[PDB]
Amino acid sequence: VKNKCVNFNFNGLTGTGVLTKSNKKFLPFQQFGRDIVDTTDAVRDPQT
């Protein structure tokens, strides 16, 4: 469920937040996302 504050457990990466569609350019070998200060920002759906 998107655009709704939910607890997520993507591939053992526990946390909480609001997730939605994005226009990142994840390379085929990429799995996670991060920012300048090293906080997980984007994740790739294991079944999608």
Partner: peptide, 24 residues
């Protein structure tokens, strides 16, 4: 056979250390 001449690698041979996306 083979030779063992020496050259300079320039700026070459950098891979992605991890699998984490980063921009700017």
């Amino acid at each position: 056979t083979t030779t063992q001449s020496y050259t300079n690698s320039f700026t070459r041979g950098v891979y992605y250390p991890d699998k984490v996306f980063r921009s700017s």
